[PDB]
């Protein structure tokens, strides 16, 4: 019964911002000491009681998410924090209880060119509801004229990507993100991390 976080940051095909991935961490336990304290991370925004004590408490259930984000775009990585992400890609749960273990991998998850490994959202009916995703590639209908499902004036393909490459500056540099909803449910509560 050993489930390392390896499998998550080893997901070298890190999912796109909107098209994040999941792993229902349940009925498993593993020790995450070195990569949580001795980690080379940056902007360890992990909420909860603290960055620690999670490797000391059992978990009700744990859910994993991966984001591939522009460098300082982290500003928008918070529920109720507005921006061109919450409006379009992932407005975090208004009362987000899980946490964030994001950090810059300029080498990892980016290579020279217009990297095709990540995509995000630009145009929507309205602000995306918290804690969900959009798969749609339907065009951006908002207003008077119809557009018969082709891109054009006031109807654009809503998923444009900043396919950056490692050469950028920190704000435009690559940034891995992972979001870990340590959610809390009833009698089935089968995760621990000592």
């Amino acid at each position: 019964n050993l489930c390392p976080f390896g499998e998550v940051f080893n997901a070298t095909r890190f999912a796109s911002v909107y098209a994040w991935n999941r792993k229902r961490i349940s009925n498993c336990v593993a020790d995450y000491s070195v990569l949580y304290n001795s980690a080379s991370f940056s902007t360890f925004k992990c909420y909860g009681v603290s960055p620690t004590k999670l490797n000391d408490l059992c978990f009700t259930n744990v859910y994993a998410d991966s984001f591939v984000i522009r460098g300082d775009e982290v500003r928008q990585i918070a529920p109720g924090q507005t921006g061109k992400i919450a409006d379009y890609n992932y407005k975090l749960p208004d009362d987000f209880t899980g946490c964030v273990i994001a950090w810059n991998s300029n080498n990892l998850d980016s290579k020279v060119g217009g990297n095709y490994n990540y995509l995000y959202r630009l145009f929507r009916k309205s602000n995306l509801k918290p804690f969900e995703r959009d798969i749609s590639t339907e065009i951006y209908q908002a207003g008077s004229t119809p557009c018969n499902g082709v891109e054009g004036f006031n109807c654009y393909f809503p998923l444009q990507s900043y396919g950056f490459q490692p050469t950028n500056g920190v704000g435009y540099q690559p940034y891995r993100v992972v979001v870990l909803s340590f959610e809390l449910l009833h009698a089935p509560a089968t995760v621990c991390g000592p």
Partner: antibody
Amino acid sequence: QLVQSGPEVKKPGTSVKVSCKASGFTFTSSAVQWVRQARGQRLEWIGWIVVGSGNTNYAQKFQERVTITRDMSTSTAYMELSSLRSEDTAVYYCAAPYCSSTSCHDAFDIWGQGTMVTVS
Amino acid sequence: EIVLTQSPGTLSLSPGERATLSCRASQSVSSSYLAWYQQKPGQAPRLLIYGASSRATGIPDRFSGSGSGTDFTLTISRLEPEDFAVYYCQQYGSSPWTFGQGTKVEIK
């Protein structure tokens, strides 16, 4: 309304940027197009760029001979071109549909004073 | 696509205008995404009609147009003979958005 930047006098050979400023209507709810004219000329197109995206469009006349840019902080729009020609003198009109955050019109109605873009 | 057409060239008229202006192309293209604009001696090219049968919240009454698809038309049924400017057609639709030949209106 709209206020284009000042009448900009650049060299007949140069690389030129141009700036436009809004009023009421917000770029990040619409797109902005660039077109050219002079005193009597056919009102000729350049291109247009979404504001949400960097997606810009233009004839085969501008594949490498064009560059547009936006400002989500100042909400000032810009174009530029590198290694233009003396023929490229014109009153560079930028226009954009009246849009206020899902309150949009479908018409390139709003045409500023016009930067006299003068390659001289 | 590029070769648009506007038959009336430089129409010549006088006060008491029931004039009209029509737009064709070298190609059959969309209908919901084409417009006519008004340009005076030294003014910003103002908006007249976006789409054949259409108007804005402020564009003047007695102002209209029709047609679709293949061919387009406009008119201003009555008018105070104040200003007689150039009128510009422009499809945008699908790329590349482009502008028309431009037809003038004057007074004898």
